[model samples]
Target: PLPWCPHLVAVCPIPAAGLDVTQPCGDCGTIQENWVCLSCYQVYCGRYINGHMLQHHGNSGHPLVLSYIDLSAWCYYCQAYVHHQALLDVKNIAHQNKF
Candidate 1:
């Protein structure tokens, strides 16, 4: 099933598939800092990489994007990052991966 989000309720507790250190952006085929598409679980590179993240946004009205490398999330509705729980989730996961 496809993920849905208004407040990103559908993407609570980021999926295990998204935690992959390899192939961060499947479309771009790069492992750099990327953004995860909430609906399809597809990850894409950030603006710094190739602007694919924003491009994804352009394609859709509200694409909830969670930063793969950084602990932050962007909402098209809010048009910015707020105090979302997913941020905390990512930080913990990142710490666990860290030596």
Candidate 2:
């Protein structure tokens, strides 16, 4: 893997359903920005908001997650933003939902 890898290798299966960031966090139920598991697409509160996202990563190590706000991605493996076409597709869904 050069300086970069195409995407995180999946150790877990991505749940059939993705996330809706516009909705409240799955944990703290806060009405704010949220993060979704790239592998499972499970929605959770952000690190600053409630830290549920961080906790999810700690337990699952799923790595990449697409941001609902700007449609960017964050990778725990790279410890930085990563590229994936899913980011755009997910973003478009959120937009269509008016989230």
Candidate 3:
């Protein structure tokens, strides 16, 4: 797990119930391999799918994203998964909603 993520913000970027956890990718309209943008809470298909999330990161410069399938936080800039209390709540909530 990554100890720190450079793009992580202090306050939660996601609003209340901001993620359905099952929502389809906003760009590609596919739910599989969806990753929610930590900056804007927008869902986009990940690298294995349409690579919309990567494109989004390139265009928007929002490096942090959370996986919809695994509830894991990833930093595009760091090129690794991250772990932090700030991200835990979102993961917890997503897990709760998913189940």
Candidate 4:
């Protein structure tokens, strides 16, 4: 089932499958459990490690981000996991790189 999140409508300018998904967090430099901001495409660590992604959310107001671990998209404003037709291209590209 697809999430009806309107926030998913935000488009990433560069949906390249080759984007640096493996990069370290922009702030603390932690490599595990990172996320790519869908708005600016910046890499940052997840909450458990340092919550740099949350920091980015607070500062940049970019609601949607893609998880490097599971390829899932999360919305900070909606405060839930979000997926929609707008995300298909990047999701498929990430999926292609996953396997």
Q: Which predicted model would earn the best TM-score?
A: 3
Model 1, residue 30: C-alpha shift (Å): 2.3
Error of 1 at 99 (Å): 6.0
Please give, for residues 3-97, the per-residue lDDT of candidate 4 as tens digits. 66776656566545466667899988888999989888889999999999999999988989989899888998888887787877777776776
TM-score of each: 0.64, 0.73, 0.91, 0.88
State residue 92's C-alpha deviation in candidate 1, in Å: 3.4
lDDT (0-100) at residue 1 of candidate 4?
Answer: 32
Cα lDDT of model 3 overall? 0.83
Superposed on all Cα atoms, model 1 deviates from the true structure by an RMSD in Å of: 5.5
Specify the poorest-scoring 10-residue window by lDDT in model 3: 10-19
Number of clashing residue pairs, candidate 2: 0
Better of 2 and 3 by TM-score: 3
lDDT (10s digit) by residue, model 3, range 1-99: 787877677324568755698899897699799988887888899899999999999998888888888888888888999988888778887888888
The TM-score of predicted model 2 comes to 0.73
Alpha-carbon lDDT of model 4: 0.82
The list of candidate 2 runs beyond 4 A from truth reads 1-6, 11-19
What root-mean-square deviation over C-alphas does model 2 reach?
3.7
Query: 68 in model 3: Cα distance from truth in Å?
Result: 0.8
Model 1, CA-based lDDT: 0.63
